[PDB]
Design an enzyme around this catalytic site. Structure first.
Site, PDB file in Angstrom:
ATOM      1  N   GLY A   1       6.404   3.921   6.710  1.00 40.31           N
ATOM      2  CA  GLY A   1       5.633   5.159   6.893  1.00 40.31           C
ATOM      3  C   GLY A   1       5.370   5.444   8.265  1.00 40.31           C
ATOM      4  N   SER A   2       4.243   4.817   8.325  1.00 39.99           N
ATOM      5  CA  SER A   2       3.407   4.731   9.983  1.00 39.99           C
ATOM      6  C   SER A   2       3.582   5.961  10.635  1.00 39.99           C
ATOM      7  CB  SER A   2       4.005   3.624  10.574  1.00 39.99           C
ATOM      8  OG  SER A   2       3.353   3.065  11.778  1.00 39.99           O
TER       9      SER A   2
ATOM     10  N   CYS B   1      20.644   9.526  -1.601  1.00 40.50           N
ATOM     11  CA  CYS B   1      19.526   9.397  -0.693  1.00 40.50           C
ATOM     12  C   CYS B   1      19.497   9.530   0.815  1.00 40.50           C
ATOM     13  CB  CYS B   1      18.751   8.192  -1.150  1.00 40.50           C
ATOM     14  SG  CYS B   1      19.851   6.923  -1.843  1.00 40.50           S
TER      15      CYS B   1
ATOM     16  N   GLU C   1       9.681   1.604  10.941  1.00 43.14           N
ATOM     17  CA  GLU C   1      11.189   2.248  10.762  1.00 43.14           C
ATOM     18  C   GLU C   1      10.991   3.728  11.149  1.00 43.14           C
ATOM     19  OE1 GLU C   1      14.310   1.939   9.846  1.00 43.14           O
ATOM     20  OE2 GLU C   1      14.692   1.222   7.768  1.00 43.14           O
TER      21      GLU C   1
ATOM     22  N   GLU D   1      10.054  17.266  14.082  1.00 44.39           N
ATOM     23  CA  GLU D   1      10.681  17.009  12.979  1.00 44.39           C
ATOM     24  C   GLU D   1       9.871  17.340  11.878  1.00 44.39           C
ATOM     25  OE1 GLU D   1      11.960  12.410  13.264  1.00 44.39           O
ATOM     26  OE2 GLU D   1      12.830  13.151  11.508  1.00 44.39           O
TER      27      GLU D   1
ATOM     28  N   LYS E   1       0.875  -1.250   0.081  1.00 43.97           N
ATOM     29  CA  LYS E   1      -0.126  -0.076   0.034  1.00 43.97           C
ATOM     30  C   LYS E   1       0.822   1.254   0.082  1.00 43.97           C
ATOM     31  CE  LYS E   1      -1.364   3.262   2.393  1.00 43.97           C
ATOM     32  NZ  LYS E   1      -2.215   4.295   1.887  1.00 43.97           N
TER      33      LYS E   1
END
Lengths: 457, 457, 457, 457
Positions: A233-234, A275, A241, A373, A180
């Site tokens: 993401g979460s 990155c 992560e 953040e 997703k």
């Protein structure tokens, strides 16, 4: 020289090898152009169930996990080749949905290609143990096996690159996958589905279900047929992560010019870099002023603007939410007495918004912008006198994605590298993932379990 | 407080679990006391054949290799315990035959005890690989197996300690062993045979054949039933081992006092140190004079004399041959224009000879004493300006047992550690093996082979 | 359809990147055609010294070992590609010098190509250990490093294939190499030198010195600048390699037809098979007669003759020496009462000699042909009643290259696989190396040493 | 001969090294005696916060993770010794709270002692990788580090044994720990806290917070300062653990008597067995009737009754809930047409309840008792004709704790071992964890993360 879509492109989602039509749809406009670009299905909980069932079916019936690793590697390498042929197309849709500079998107793709190739090689090396020393009547061994059906949820900032750091390693062990992606950056995840079909991935091994966190994400977290759930993401494992408050610790005995370059590259995009965003600078007080001046001079050369311009280094703000967070952040920093050294504004460049490279100094760890953040080229500088002060400032977050240290002193370099909690560490070099690896050795094992086997006579 | 033997002790040699009487004998006097101490069998080629046959029999009949690793570990740990109970007895015979200071012998024993315990643990961890990723019709694995019958030849300088760095790891895999120690220092090797019998080692697993290199050594090297031959003095494998010209590289940015201490400890014996002689000093020219003065001051405190005095740090010359090599060496060094900074003589202390701690400086690599090698507390100092000069001086030998570097600069430390050829490397610490290891991970594997196994359906 | 050379081709030898002219020469005729084909330099001890010096120079100066592993892999993969383009040329010279069937030579080349590709991948994976658990003041690690200059001596039976099982793995770690191939089969070793130059191997990394065992081999074994010496025919390490009396153990509960096929393929060359000769059959007595009849029927279909015929399965005898050994062997077997079941003769087919596929049965282990060894399609059958009888017959040699077992019984299969001493084991499959590996994991490590590194604070 | 407590023993909970008094309390009676035995604090969400803070403090301040691994191993080995001295006391409280037979509790303790010793050894072996092959300007390595603060939730069936399979490995890496045991079986978890304090574990490294799943469990799952959450009943990682429907697959070519013994031992407790309950039998139809008769005969010898009787093999039902599940289960099985072959009832033996060893046969996978799960000596037998039928019946659950197969046929044994999803597999042996391991190699790594380190020049 770059034409936008005449009409927004309507995607289907991807289940059991075939494209599926949406019912409701999320309309996505280009963050840089304010022009409709994509139309993404908002899938239902029932859609996710079908994707899981397809991935279940494809795992249990032997069509992927039962192949030799060489056959899985062949598919992954063919996908890597297709991904190379379609680099310009994938970069184009990534820029359109995310605002990223085109040169950064193309550089991320090259890193993605390399991930596919690592996963392919590591598929063949995956191995367990034999215990031939139990005596004559007894033989022991450990086997490694795919965990099974993996749910993956990716975020909007590095949508394609996080996908390719995970998906090929997940597939390499024989796992099957349901993804997703973020509603605002789904296109490239679906183009990867197409690439993997064209590379010969069996049906149901890679499934994309698009839609909201409330609907598809929740159905995923609560599904009882997913063996492993990975949020970037979460049912045995769930991985999360961590954040992009990656600190860069600079000591007085370091090469301050190279270190300042690394801060500049770590906040923008430069050629040969890929990155690793950094957002916290931790610099020895006795050189803080000279070094910060070095960094500000480089930060003010960073090119901002049209993401399809190959020279742009900072692209457009991806979502309207991220826009208020930044102006809030900077306002908070001023209120608490942090000193703005450069930037501080959002540039309205035509029909897009762009964050100026921004550097706060004189930031105490107790300030509110040290906790909070943000994503964007926004940098906060802390000062220290002792090695242990640097380490404690660096560790003030929950856990770090990346970190680096600049020092010619072996004791200071090693102390920081060992005691600062981060997954990837650079020592007197630029933090980058672009032009053996840890991911080469370990990316595939992460989606496996061990079976111990005990054989009498 | 220490009594010498009233009459020299006559040993037998050790084959297939039993003591065997010699015919001819080597009479050995104490290097420090000029008093007969031991009588060692000079075995025949026929004796060595019997030892090999016994070790062959014990390997092939399952009595050792067929046991579970736990049973091999139990024997090795019991031997470690017996070795602890008999520490004073083994140190006594070691001092008597070799001249070593008693405190150094006791310290070497403690390292030997630890080797037995490492080998015991590693016996259980020994393992190979499984390949579960070849598809459904195919299964692969690698097994580790003992190499078989191992011939070991040990030297006179560290007779017991080299034996215990090898023998317990050889036995841990299931190998069997035939040892030929140096004619002048055989007693402790036979006392280890007794220890291993008392610990329950099956017959023929450990065999000691004493005698000359010309007779027993040659029969060993030419024997066609030994699977592996390991020389530490000097059929699938033969290993050799290298020299004690271990270099210590000192940079100006280092802690010169600690570095000088390490040079002093590396040439004598100090408490908490064990077993890494060093004989070449490689010091940055800009600090060579200050540092060499530091080293000479410490070298002149080193206590020389009665090896049974627990404070002695330098013991007696072991053989009459080693005696002429030293006076020759020093003479050569003077002739070629090397500057003697201290020592240079052999002390006649009663009925023994003792090498003074000796330091030549201004030694060019082309000199003859840079090529030649000696055992004894004799140190040669070379000077360098660049990192690459230090490395090239350090590498001027064939291959190094040990090496160390002193530097706070991470690039210099790492460059020296990576590019200097040595098996063991110290960085800003004393070279020592006394109060995970590499030998813990790898000592046992060294005496194993791999068997690849390919199973269809 | 295949033309022999009009005049024998004169090779040079290969030192420090350049071809070198011989003085004296070995004249080699085609074993199958009795026509001059090659002219090989007989090098001097002085030539070998130069090759070692060149390999020394190329190892120590960083031109190969100092590169990143990726650069070594790139050269090895380019050589693999060149080896593919030149397959027909290398097969041609291999057939000409060795007598091998062309289809077997081409199949060995494909295995050689795969060895180059494995070595290339393994170059990147080579790694050591970190010890992060020693506390805060202490850091440990193990590094893997190339052993250095490797001497390799190859034999005449599988000249190119043994070379390619060793050389690319030796080079992958950063070692340099000096090769002495067999005087009768040198051409393909020199063509590999050309391939590696064309692939970009730096000068002195691969050197070929041709000539006799008495001159070049002896200079090699006695050279004191070679770090490792590897004999596959026949300074820290010397490896030897073992015999081709590879046993095949067949049980009554096995698939006797598949097992008989494996015996047939293991003695001849069949398509999809590569390179595992077998010469001892160990078959349960209760099925010995039925199974031996199965094997004889297949052995009499094996096609013998013109090695350039792509259907030939048995080629010409390579040397005049091998010719007397075979007729002696068969004579001995008859004298001692072994029963000849088929073959037994050497066919004079035009200007070449060819060994008939030959099978002795009723061979007791005490017979002289059970001890003696031959190369050629000559098979000896032993009978057993118990698992332990089979194992003891299988182990009656010194050590085995390969072995296999046929049995549906898991206890019998595992007992034979674990207790029979061989490096490669097949279970209910054809012994073959043609269309993860152990050589993939371990081939490169074999030419490395470990350096333990101990860093205080 | 065993006296119950005169008054129920009131425990405190355990935070930051000290015992803490409860406010509210859970009163626990002996399942076998219906007599009050323990009084357990029902902690608050605030209590759990303090435990997490203490574990946070102890992780971050270096008191545990900063020690050398040897110091962590010393504490773990001392705890193992204390656990041995207190075996009878821990078994006593385990029996009292759980109903387990005393001989099973004592046998589980011995397995627990061994877990502490494995963890201690593995603490020293924990290691990462070095990449010495990146070229001269670049050095890479991977470090292993403790994950941090671990939350552990244990269940009521094997309260002490699951704790000791996890806790010592968690502590060995340097992690800190907060445990919530089941409200009905908390005593032995607190006695382990006492043991670890007595062994010298620093404060806050091991914390026990007792109470309900609703209060303490939920606070634990939602706590944002726990790095890893491990449920064995039921912030980067969360692990779950699976069921005890462990299948035993029996083939006609197996040793039916040994296989039947293994079924009997796997459902009861026998001496020398430890801790692998099995509840599904999967037996080849052609021998199902003979084998089931074998199993019923052994099941009817299983001794049931007073858990403090050292001969008891089946203890008392632990909770009143488990009691209705069993009578429901058996009722369901009868209703759906499964054939009861023995047992079926709950024995009221004085003041306790005991499940009869119970075996249903003729169970189709579609039945409701094939889905449903129970704890207790209740066994369901399925029949199969083909290898793939056995595997599909075995895999009909979500994921297996354990599994075993009985067959002399190597293809059937290997096919079942590879294709049946279980973490631990037995082949022709009794499933047991009592009198190298996988847990030896891997238990410690499970609570670590990897840090990749990239050092330029």
């Amino acid at each position: 020289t770059v034409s936008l879509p005449l009409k927004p492109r309507e995607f289907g989602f991807f289940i059991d090898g075939e494209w599926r039509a949406g019912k409701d749809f999320f309309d996505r406009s280009s963050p840089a152009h304010d022009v409709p670009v994509t139309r993404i299905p908002r899938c239902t909980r029932e859609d996710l169930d079908e994707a899981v069932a397809a991935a279940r079916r494809a795992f249990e019936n032997g069509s992927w996990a039962g192949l030799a690793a060489a056959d899985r590697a062949a598919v992954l390498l063919k996908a890597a080749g297709l991904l190379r042929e379609r680099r310009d197309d994938i970069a184009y849709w990534e820029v359109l949905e995310n605002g990223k500079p085109i040169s950064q998107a193309k550089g991320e793709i090259d890193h993605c290609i390399a991930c596919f190739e690592m996963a392919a090689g590591a598929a063949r090396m995956l191995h367990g143990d034999t215990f031939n020393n139990l005596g004559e009547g007894l033989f022991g061994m450990v086997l490694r096996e795919p965990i099974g059906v993996v749910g993956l949820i990716t975020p909007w900032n590095f949508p394609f690159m996080i996908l390719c750091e995970r998906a090929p390693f997940i597939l390499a062990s024989g796992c099957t996958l349901v993804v997703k992606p973020a509603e605002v950056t789904s296109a490239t995840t679906l183009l990867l589905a197409e690439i993997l079909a064209d590379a010969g991935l069996p049906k149901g091994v890679f499934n994309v279900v698009t839609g909201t966190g409330r609907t598809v994400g929740q159905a995923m977290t609560e599904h009882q047929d997913i063996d492993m759930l990975s949020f970037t993401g979460s049912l045995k494992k769930l991985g999360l992560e961590l954040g992009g408050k990656n600190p860069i610790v600079v000591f007085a005995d370091s090469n301050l010019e190279d270190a300042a370059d690394a801060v500049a590259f770590g906040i923008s995009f430069n050629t040969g870099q890929c990155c690793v965003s950094s957002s916290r600078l931790i610099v020895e007080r006795s050189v803080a002023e000279k070094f910060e001046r070095l960094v500000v001079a480089k930060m003010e050369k960073i090119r901002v603007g049209d993401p399809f311009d190959p020279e742009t280094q900072i692209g457009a703000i991806t979502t309207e939410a991220q826009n208020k967070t930044i102006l809030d952040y900077i306002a908070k920093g001023k209120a608490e007495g942090a000193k703005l050294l450069c930037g501080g504004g959002i540039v309205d460049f035509g029909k897009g918004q762009y964050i100026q490279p921004t550097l706060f100094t004189d930031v105490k760890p107790s300030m509110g912008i040290a906790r909070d953040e943000i994503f964007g080229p926004v940098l906060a500088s802390f000062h220290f006198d002792t090695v242990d002060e640097a380490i404690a400032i660096a560790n003030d977050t929950v856990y770090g994605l990346a970190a680096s240290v600049w020092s010619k002193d072996i004791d200071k370099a090693l102390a920081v590298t060992r005691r600062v909690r981060a997954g990837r560490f650079w020592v007197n070099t630029i933090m980058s993932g672009g032009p053996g690896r840890e991911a080469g050795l370990y990316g595939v094992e992460e989606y496996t379990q061990i079976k111990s086997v005990h054989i009498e006579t």
